[PDB]
Design a protein around this motif. Structure first.
Motif, mmCIF file in Angstrom:
data_model
loop_
_atom_site.group_PDB
_atom_site.id
_atom_site.type_symbol
_atom_site.label_atom_id
_atom_site.label_comp_id
_atom_site.label_asym_id
_atom_site.label_seq_id
_atom_site.Cartn_x
_atom_site.Cartn_y
_atom_site.Cartn_z
ATOM 1 N N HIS C 6 -6.056 -14.265 89.340
ATOM 2 C CA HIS C 6 -6.894 -14.739 88.763
ATOM 3 C C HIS C 6 -8.496 -14.488 88.994
ATOM 4 O O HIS C 6 -9.142 -15.186 89.721
ATOM 5 N N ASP D 38 -13.703 0.247 78.551
ATOM 6 C CA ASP D 38 -12.327 -0.099 77.879
ATOM 7 C C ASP D 38 -11.486 -0.028 79.152
ATOM 8 O O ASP D 38 -10.878 -0.371 79.383
ATOM 9 N N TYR D 39 -11.640 1.210 79.969
ATOM 10 C CA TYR D 39 -11.142 0.986 81.186
ATOM 11 C C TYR D 39 -11.669 0.781 82.425
ATOM 12 O O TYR D 39 -13.241 1.410 82.372
ATOM 13 N N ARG D 40 -11.609 -0.339 83.415
ATOM 14 C CA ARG D 40 -12.137 -0.662 84.489
ATOM 15 C C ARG D 40 -12.043 0.715 85.693
ATOM 16 O O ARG D 40 -11.910 -0.106 86.607
ATOM 17 N N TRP D 82 -12.855 8.918 73.440
ATOM 18 C CA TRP D 82 -12.141 9.546 74.569
ATOM 19 C C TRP D 82 -10.403 8.372 74.423
ATOM 20 O O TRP D 82 -10.543 7.672 73.619
ATOM 21 N N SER D 83 -9.394 10.053 75.398
ATOM 22 C CA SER D 83 -8.486 8.765 75.225
ATOM 23 C C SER D 83 -7.610 9.330 76.442
ATOM 24 O O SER D 83 -8.006 10.444 77.077
ATOM 25 N N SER D 108 -1.805 19.221 70.655
ATOM 26 C CA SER D 108 -0.330 19.171 69.460
ATOM 27 C C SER D 108 0.120 20.833 69.419
ATOM 28 O O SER D 108 1.478 20.621 69.305
ATOM 29 N N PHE F 18 -1.665 -12.486 85.559
ATOM 30 C CA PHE F 18 -2.929 -12.644 86.580
ATOM 31 C C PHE F 18 -3.013 -13.949 87.258
ATOM 32 O O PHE F 18 -3.235 -14.473 88.638
ATOM 33 N N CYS F 109 -1.997 14.310 64.747
ATOM 34 C CA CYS F 109 -2.355 13.790 66.379
ATOM 35 C C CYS F 109 -3.410 12.680 66.068
ATOM 36 O O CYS F 109 -3.288 12.149 64.337
ATOM 37 N N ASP F 118 -5.012 -6.690 81.094
ATOM 38 C CA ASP F 118 -6.461 -6.790 81.945
ATOM 39 C C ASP F 118 -7.601 -6.464 80.952
ATOM 40 O O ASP F 118 -8.855 -7.061 81.699
ATOM 41 N N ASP F 119 -7.575 -6.837 79.735
ATOM 42 C CA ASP F 119 -8.647 -7.698 78.865
ATOM 43 C C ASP F 119 -8.984 -5.718 79.259
ATOM 44 O O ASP F 119 -10.651 -5.947 78.739
ATOM 45 N N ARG F 120 -8.629 -4.976 79.405
ATOM 46 C CA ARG F 120 -8.797 -3.478 79.041
ATOM 47 C C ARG F 120 -8.140 -2.664 77.499
ATOM 48 O O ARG F 120 -7.368 -3.327 77.606
ATOM 49 N N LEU F 121 -9.017 -1.768 77.256
ATOM 50 C CA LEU F 121 -8.554 -0.692 75.299
ATOM 51 C C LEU F 121 -8.513 0.651 76.396
ATOM 52 O O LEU F 121 -8.653 0.741 76.521
ATOM 53 N N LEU F 122 -6.975 0.472 76.068
ATOM 54 C CA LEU F 122 -6.570 2.403 76.090
ATOM 55 C C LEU F 122 -6.824 3.338 74.452
ATOM 56 O O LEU F 122 -5.653 3.114 73.146
ATOM 57 N N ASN F 123 -7.216 3.976 74.612
ATOM 58 C CA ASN F 123 -6.229 4.826 73.716
ATOM 59 C C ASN F 123 -5.344 6.382 74.327
ATOM 60 O O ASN F 123 -6.123 7.520 74.871
ATOM 61 N N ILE F 124 -4.715 5.628 74.173
ATOM 62 C CA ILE F 124 -3.553 6.846 74.071
ATOM 63 C C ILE F 124 -3.083 7.457 72.975
ATOM 64 O O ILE F 124 -2.671 7.960 71.647
ATOM 65 N N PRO F 125 -2.868 9.026 73.568
ATOM 66 C CA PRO F 125 -3.339 10.592 72.569
ATOM 67 C C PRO F 125 -1.382 10.376 72.327
ATOM 68 O O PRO F 125 -0.438 9.931 72.634
ATOM 69 N N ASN F 127 0.264 13.367 69.751
ATOM 70 C CA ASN F 127 0.692 15.266 69.774
ATOM 71 C C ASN F 127 1.953 14.825 69.424
ATOM 72 O O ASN F 127 2.154 15.932 68.667
ATOM 73 N N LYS F 136 6.011 6.176 73.753
ATOM 74 C CA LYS F 136 5.209 7.741 74.830
ATOM 75 C C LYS F 136 4.939 6.282 75.688
ATOM 76 O O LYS F 136 5.202 4.808 75.531
ATOM 77 N N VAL F 138 3.481 4.918 78.822
ATOM 78 C CA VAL F 138 2.179 4.761 79.885
ATOM 79 C C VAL F 138 2.590 4.464 81.167
ATOM 80 O O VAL F 138 2.313 3.281 80.972
ATOM 81 N N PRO F 139 2.350 5.482 81.833
ATOM 82 C CA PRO F 139 3.218 4.876 84.022
ATOM 83 C C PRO F 139 2.231 4.488 84.163
ATOM 84 O O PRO F 139 0.637 4.347 84.316
ATOM 85 N N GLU F 141 1.398 1.107 84.067
ATOM 86 C CA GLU F 141 0.173 0.292 83.348
ATOM 87 C C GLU F 141 1.163 -1.497 83.157
ATOM 88 O O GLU F 141 0.493 -0.979 81.904
ATOM 89 N N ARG G 176 -1.472 15.930 55.826
ATOM 90 C CA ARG G 176 -2.380 14.853 56.460
ATOM 91 C C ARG G 176 -3.351 14.607 54.651
ATOM 92 O O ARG G 176 -4.103 13.782 53.999
#
Lengths: 8, 46, 26, 239, 51, 181, 181
Positions: C6, D38-40, D82-83, D108, F18, F109, F118-125, F127, F136, F138-139, F141, G176
């Motif tokens: 928290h 976005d990533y802390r 970003w990814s 890919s 939390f 893609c 966590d209120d964190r945003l992820l852009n996971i590829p 492919n 997929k 996302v280890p 996490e 696409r």
């Protein structure tokens, strides 16, 4: 047993 | 008595433990003691 | 040796500009 | 390198000549700030580029409190998008050993030697970090809490200490870090002085494209890998 | 690329890394900034001696 | 004796991520020495919910539940239960995300936008070619482990592919030239 | 009395479709009129399998089991079950056919070749876009009813869509432009 008098 | 066994085993650790707990006065002294003993190893043994 | 022995988060106004300025690059 | 390397062209100031355009530099400033949102991450350093045959992978690395943690890699082809790149392991290090050639822009892409280009990106970035990620001597101070922090009182190296490989550290798990003087081959590191000798440039010969920046007068430093992305196995012949 | 109608044609040789060619569509120039070596996918073989 | 009341209390993912705290007002059937009263001595029981507590984790309050004249009270406020979310399904220290990817984005893609706990945003590829068994990992996490709050499990991203509902004959030729060759 | 000799009558979907005869050897375990002796001839029980019998319908033979010392037996060779045919499985009154289909034919229509238990080849046209959660009912084409050997159930043709394993950049642009629009 009687640690209440012994060690505390 | 069983004093001598625990004379050797604990010694300074419980003294520092309750000294810190009495100084801090946390809401949960028992959990604080357990966490402190964990940390006390993590400094001493390592 | 002494150092041996928290959750909320806040952030600056510098990312609302960054939120604003990514549209420049899109 | 940090955001200070993106307000000014610190990359091209090293004389390696490869770096980011001001387009990519401003885009990267905004995008790495948004990545830190976005990533802390404690910090978001621009790792560098993997110059591909179709498009270049712009790479960023997340830094925790706790800077020797298993640093989190990100990639982007159009800079801003970003990814989160996956983390590296030993199996994926062994997987790509049968493959050689230049990177393809599409991650890919498949090799029949199948193997994804994303796995190549992950493994090659890990190998570059374990081999040739530079930290100057005293920039990082092992905190008593079992965590590495920035030595925020770090004064840049004396010019006597500039010329020694012992004054530079591998930025990875192991003064705690391993020095560069044991990084075989013995001549594997090139030390040169630019910009009135207010600038130390330290380039990897084993991994060409790496150029480590350092200003001895202050604590401004950083490393960027802008290059082809292969290991120079020909290094002992070339020395 | 964000403003393509003022772009400059970039060329990356892939035979001599650091070698570049450029042109706005009218003029041109060339520039090398590499280590001075030819790229090879295979590792450097020292040449065999004469028979 | 009479059994403890196995009360179920629902915790969403952020509460168990939390480590929130919870209050549950309890019964007023506490007896005095007269053994016929109905009063209350402690209105509220508090549980310090720590991160990573799995479903079915039993928290027991001995000598706090309902009491008859000649039995010991007891109560099991609460069995850890999980609320539905938009969306991660709780398993053994792993989070399972479902991304409604459209077809055409599945086969090429793709980047999956994952808000985390966590209120964190992820852009996971993505492919790989997303067939309807692909996921997929996302280890490191997922949610924190109950035995170690510093360490966390893995996030799983499953895909529910949305096939097209109508195709032009041009689109049929488009697809036949692309996929069957 | 002594418990029944519970045995599984093994029958494939073709045999329950048409019907058959099966003999089960008891054989040399009943106690004879010698008072008492287990030596018996190779006695045999025949089961006239009628068409359309369901999985789990009980066939019971009274007094045909291992007779005890004045104990009434019963050779209950009763479970109708269940051999997974290479082409069909069985739910209640319905054959469920699984057709592996490539994605191009799944999206741009196809014709499914079903070889029935009756040894008929069914060319079933599929001209809807085949979702992963898609099936077509071919009514009157299942197994016969047990209550009516002239009437038949419904055949269900489910699909296992085979996505491509590789797509070139041309194939990626192909898809696409085709789907994501």
């Amino acid at each position: 047993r009687d640690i209440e008098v012994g060690f505390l | 008595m069983d004093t001598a066994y625990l004379k050797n085993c604990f010694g300074t650790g419980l003294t520092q433990a309750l000294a810190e707990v009495a100084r801090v006065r946390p809401s949960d002294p028992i959990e604080y003691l357990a966490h402190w003993l964990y940390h006390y190893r993590s400094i001493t043994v390592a | 040796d002494v150092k041996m022995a928290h959750n909320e988060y806040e952030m600056l106004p510098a990312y609302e500009i960054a939120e604003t300025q990514k549209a420049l690059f899109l | 390198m940090d955001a200070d390397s993106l307000l000014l062209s610190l990359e091209l100031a090293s004389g390696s000549g490869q770096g980011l355009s001001p387009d990519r530099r401003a885009s990267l400033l905004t995008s790495l700030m948004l990545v830190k949102r976005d990533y802390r991450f404690a910090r978001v350093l621009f790792w560098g580029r993997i110059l591909g045959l179709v498009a270049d992978y712009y790479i960023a690395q997340g830094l925790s409190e706790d800077q020797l943690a298993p640093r989190k890699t990100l990639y982007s082809l159009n800079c801003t998008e970003w990814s989160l790149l996956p983390p590296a392991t030993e199996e994926m290090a062994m997987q790509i050993s049968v493959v050689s050639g230049r990177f393809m822009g599409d991650p890919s892409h498949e090799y029949e030697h199948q193997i994804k280009e994303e796995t190549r990106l992950v493994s090659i970035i890990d190998q570059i970090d374990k081999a040739v990620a530079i930290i100057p001597r005293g920039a990082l101070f092992k905190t008593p809490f079992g965590v590495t922090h920035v030595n925020r009182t770090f004064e840049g190296l004396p010019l006597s200490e500039v010329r020694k490989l012992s004054s530079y550290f591998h930025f990875r798990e192991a003064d705690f870090l391993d020095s560069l003087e044991y990084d075989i081959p013995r001549g594997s590191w090139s030390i040169q002085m630019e910009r009135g000798n207010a600038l130390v440039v330290l380039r990897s010969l084993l991994w060409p494209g790496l150029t480590f920046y350092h200003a001895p007068r202050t604590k401004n430093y950083g490393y960027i890998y802008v290059g082809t992305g292969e290991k120079n196995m020909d290094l002992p012949f070339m020395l | 690329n964000l403003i393509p109608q003022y772009a400059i044609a970039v060329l990356r040789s892939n035979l001599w890394p650091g070698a570049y060619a450029f042109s706005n569509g009218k003029k041109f120039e060339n520039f090398y900034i590499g280590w001075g070596h030819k790229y090879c996918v295979e590792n450097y073989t020292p040449p065999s001696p004469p028979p | 004796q009479d059994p403890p009341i196995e009360r179920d209390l629902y915790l969403s993912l952020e509460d168990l991520f939390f480590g929130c705290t919870k209050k549950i007002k309890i019964s007023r059937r506490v007896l005095n020495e007269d053994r016929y009263s109905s009063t209350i001595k402690d209105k509220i029981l508090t549980i310090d919910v720590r991160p990573g507590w799995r479903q079915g984790t039993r928290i027991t309050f001995e000598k706090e539940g309902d009491q008859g004249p000649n039995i010991i009270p007891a109560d099991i406020i609460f069995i850890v239960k999980e609320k539905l979310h938009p969306r991660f399904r709780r398993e053994h220290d792993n989070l399972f995300f479902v991304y409604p990817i459209p077809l055409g984005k599945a086969l090429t893609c793709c980047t999956v936008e994952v808000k985390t706990l966590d209120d964190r945003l992820l852009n996971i590829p993505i492919n790989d070619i997303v067939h309807p068994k692909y996921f997929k990992i996302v280890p490191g996490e997922g949610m924190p482990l109950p035995e170690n709050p510093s360490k966390k499990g893995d996030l799983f991203i499953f895909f529910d592919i949305q096939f097209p509902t109508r195709l032009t004959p041009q689109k049929k030729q488009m697809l036949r030239q692309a996929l069957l060759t």
